[PDB]
Amino acid sequence: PALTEAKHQQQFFQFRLSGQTIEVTSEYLFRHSDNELLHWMVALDGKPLASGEVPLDVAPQGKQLIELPELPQPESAGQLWLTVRVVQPNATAWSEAGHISAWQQWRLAENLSVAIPHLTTSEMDFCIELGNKRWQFNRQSGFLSQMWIGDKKQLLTPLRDQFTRAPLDNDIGVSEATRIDPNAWVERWKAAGHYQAEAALLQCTADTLADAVLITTAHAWQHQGKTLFISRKTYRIDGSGQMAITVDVVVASDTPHPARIGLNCQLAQVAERVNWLGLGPQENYPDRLTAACFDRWDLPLSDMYTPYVFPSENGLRCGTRELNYGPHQWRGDFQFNISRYSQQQLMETSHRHLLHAEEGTWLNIDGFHMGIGGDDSWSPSVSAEFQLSAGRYHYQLVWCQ
Amino acid sequence: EAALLQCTADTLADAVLITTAHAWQHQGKTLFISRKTYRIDGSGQMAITVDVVVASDTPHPARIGLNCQLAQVAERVNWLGLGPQENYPDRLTAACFDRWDLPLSDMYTPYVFPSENGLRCGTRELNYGPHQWRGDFQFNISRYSQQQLMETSHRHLLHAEEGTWLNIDGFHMGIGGDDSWSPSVSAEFQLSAGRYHYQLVWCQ
């Protein structure tokens, strides 16, 4: 995936948007743009609204102003996105016809958007029912432990907070089981107990509102007496079957910054494809996502796993506003990865060929995710602005059918 | 102009929950949407959760917070936060986190040309009269409204209004200063995230 990032950062055309005017600057030193046309497209939440093509005629180190025709003023809600791509119409010795050599995306105008579930309480769980949908929250764990559509269970593993990732080579550095490197991210995480932290239930309560049921939970993650993380959640299940999850996390200032702040569950279903409105199509992370474009992407599940020979956290897509998998839809503003391999398996397997697809599908939905680094892979390389150091984090999801 | 989208109340087991949603609009465009929850529990504490959406295409707002005019005028302001002096997100390195206690007058900086002033950042507790606010916020507290400051050319023309204006911000824009004839607020101090969340607890 990184290659695409390189391609984007090294591209020979730079773009600047001013109103509806695109300034295309050539970083070629010698050649005129004699085999380039600029395709542009305006889209609303992934739906195209207008497009066009303009031949590039820009001298080396020169500028070309391209005036866009009046773009649409869709009175519907959502964010307009302008995407430009430079296409080489004719083949070269090194490229086929239609080769994409450069691209850029900007946000245009945004228009902001302007039966009651029955609760049954037992000593062991809260059960919420609405039509053929059923949610089961375990009161001893404090987590959404099962979901039914009709009679079919949807979860193999409860929906739980996740603050760790299968370490990247950049997280490990030169640290080895025999020769620990204490400044490596993985060693700091392990020493702080991030991978061994035991969730402790502080609160689990249910309450029926006028048109919804509200489940409020609070957990503390602890290691050797120290509280690393506190998660306080609210689950609001309303008369439309939509489960709105609000998550507020506190992170101890003195514990190493966590790799991620999100949720994970093992979904019982395995679907052939993953659809999402977000950055894609390829794997992208907070400090490697410039090359990714915001759009409606639809890929086979296999393409959501990057087969790094040394397994690690992989396949994240950021800036995601909608995720569709099977009958499930998640909405919000999150990063996600979706695969057949748990973070645990990735972490404890040395070679990709030794991975075995687990039952169902592991979904990691993150409100926040740490950078991956890469300035070097033998010292901490994640820049401060990509570390999860804020101490308090908030994210909201909506899970529905 | 604030437009009410939602205002609903609901009694929980041990608290009352008021949920509201407002849209700020100008000439047909929605600039901001605020969605709040007020949870008043059996201890008298009012927990306020605020989630704000800001249109990507509107200029980044100077602040995202709350304001009210308190009826009381107290002699002193106590706070656990950055101080003792005025500090802003791009000017707070010199401020120290501590328990500070100053006369109310010292919470107003008398710039000859009136403007936003007196902000204290990184504040976890604020005590004024019988009121206590808790969370992680920036605040200023004075006898002068933002409107009066904006519409008055000289400090000597300011008149203390009835009571005390409290501005509690979850977020506040930088002040700049590289120059004062062009935009100087660096990107990392502009409120550009599009979505903001902050929580307060107001009690006696």
Curated annotation (Swiss-Prot), chain B:
Upregulation? By allolactose.
Entry superkingdom: Bacteria
What are the cysteine partners in each disulfide bond? none
- List of residues binding substrate: W181
Coiled coil location: none
**Family statement drawn from the similarity comment of this UniProt entry:** Belongs to the glycosyl hydrolase 2 family.
Q: Specify the protein name.
A: Beta-galactosidase
Q: Which organism is it from?
A: Escherichia coli (strain K12)
